[PDB]
coat protein
Amino acid sequence: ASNFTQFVLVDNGGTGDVTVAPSNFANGVAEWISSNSRSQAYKVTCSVRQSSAQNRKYTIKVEVPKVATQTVGGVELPVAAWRSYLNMELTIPIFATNSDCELIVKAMQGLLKDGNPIPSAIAANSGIY
Amino acid sequence: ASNFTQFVLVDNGGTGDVTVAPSNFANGVAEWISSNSRSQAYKVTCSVRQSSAQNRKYTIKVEVPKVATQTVGGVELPVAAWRSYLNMELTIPIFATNSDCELIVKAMQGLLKDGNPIPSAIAANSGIY
Amino acid sequence: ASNFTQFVLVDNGGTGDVTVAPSNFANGVAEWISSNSRSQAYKVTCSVRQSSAQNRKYTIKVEVPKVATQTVGGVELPVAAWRSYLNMELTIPIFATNSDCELIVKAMQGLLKDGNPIPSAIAANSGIY
Amino acid sequence: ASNFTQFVLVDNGGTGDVTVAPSNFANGVAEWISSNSRSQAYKVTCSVRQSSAQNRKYTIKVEVPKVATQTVGGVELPVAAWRSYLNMELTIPIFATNSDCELIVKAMQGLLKDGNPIPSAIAANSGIY
Amino acid sequence: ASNFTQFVLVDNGGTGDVTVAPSNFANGVAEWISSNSRSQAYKVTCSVRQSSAQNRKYTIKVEVPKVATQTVGGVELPVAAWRSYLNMELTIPIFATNSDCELIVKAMQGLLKDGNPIPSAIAANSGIY
Amino acid sequence: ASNFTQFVLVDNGGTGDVTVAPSNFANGVAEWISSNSRSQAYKVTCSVRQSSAQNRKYTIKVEVPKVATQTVGGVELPVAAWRSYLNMELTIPIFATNSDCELIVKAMQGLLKDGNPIPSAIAANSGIY
RNA sequence: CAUGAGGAUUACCCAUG
RNA sequence: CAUGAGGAUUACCCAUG
RNA sequence: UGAGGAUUACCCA
RNA sequence: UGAGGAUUACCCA
């Protein structure tokens, strides 16, 4: 095995799909980027640490860019108008079994499923009400 | 267009599904919890605010109970041994359109899609390798 | 759903019934008032807080007014001769299940049921003996 | 006209009813408890005093045991995990007549009547939303 | 029950209507935002407070943006060329009954009805004459 | 041509309508007063000024009185028990066309339309919830 | 290390304990 | 935050730890 | 308080 | 400027 593989970050039905690939593991931080100039790339990082005597903490970060072409010094450069940042930390007690962890994963998937409250608000630029 | 409704957090296909329902709205912070004691419940909270002049920021928190060897309705100490905490912060620049936000949501869905690195690692009590 | 609804605070068989309605939720304090000038209204407030790592505390307050018409500066104003205050705090351990909570509610209902000791003393301006 | 008699605190319609009986009268503070160990009993106390020149004040306290997974007659620690505390303070101006007081009692009954906001929220481990 | 809902701010028949939706209710300040880029959105805020012993005071604010596209360095962002700022404070004595408040509301609606002096002056970039 | 005319401030069908009429236009401040005792009259004032290089600013004020009769020493005078004070400022950039201004006006009318959040809260002596 | 509906130029910074 | 059969002009104040 | 100014829940006399 | 207070075209920081 080896779970450090490439995957589809943004799925648009096999056309214009943002796919991300392993690009670095320096300092225990797994990194993935899209085939772009480092300045316009989507970026995903992940790291696990034994945060406490009885806890493990996953730190996941995703960077979604808004690509643009900027003219600096009369020259065009590939760049990012702005970036959206997702920072998530997951703390799991060492007593959690694999089935307990599967439960956490499913919860996170259900949380963001199309049609549910939260993803609906985010996509509509509104709050929950 | 009220989106503060109950939804399925953990989907086990009809049987054993965990539904989470509206339970509090104090301070604009929406809360959903499962039908359990608060020590063993699945909890979800969400709020949005203008983090700065250039950004808006969604703060999403999830609490998942350790289920293996759990005693329903019992007193389980220490608390830190029986619960997992998910803390998500999503920063979005004010220039993001609904379309941009829809993409950001897809990115989050892709990150956690079944079979991808991150969720597979979490579910197996592993890191990246 | 949504439990923030109006209800009958004082029941006098559908005639002269004091009914109270949602009027404010600012700062996480749910408020209800009767259709009156803010100076002569019945008022009910409720708020929940995670008072401790292992406790939740409900703070409920009710204000019963004695309406009157006062002549100030040679002018008649709707006002309250005096007000009666009820302040109750309920501390529930996070380990209490829904059935445990139902038990608490029933206890509070039984405590105040017509004919029982306490409501009998209060209504007769006496103590318990 | 002695009103210090036993009464039904939790009514389950004949079967499983919790009766609470006189157990102490030290210092004019009336006490009622269920037929249990004092660590698992239902307790009720009540006293009245002239809080100030303009008011009288009833202090009512109730203790409700956590029943789910309870071991009858056993030693359950920590105490704070197995008990709920209700603390009620009722302030009544000396001008209140018996009629005024009867109304104040109805207000308290209405507040807790079955199906109303407050009790429904408490019973569901919820807040207002 | 709830009045912290979505509503039509600008009515243009049934199409091109500007709808503002709840977004935040932090610190007793309710906020509504229209959809899409926060940068080009309409904003409405409202709050009430006891300004003094006898008065309650509503503070309402509205922001009407002039939608435009900013281009700099060849990078274009959705922005607001400028904004129009509405700012109103309404003081109401606590002796006001619901009847009195309805009158106050009709006064405000009348002040701005089509054809009347003030809305006509504003709409025509004019003053009084 | 003139917009400094009489108009209906409060519309109650066709009878009991409150009409306000021009009374003064000193120092760029237009004033309207309802008929009868000045002491019990409704008042409306309006003025515009170049607040800065880019902005013009409207300042509008309305006074709703609570009609009452004052009696002192057996002498009765027509007075206002109290007054409700509306106070609004509207800032509009000089780049706003007549089209833009009409939009701003519709926004104000929409903000106060019957049934919408704000006018409903005010009319009910309530806040947002 | 812990906690923040703390911030960001985003594997880094602040406050608090 | 904790405790008071502490007070009130009642979502706020006092004493104590 | 202000027919006080705004980058708009901030700031000046 | 101020979800700053009013006896409301005044006044405070």
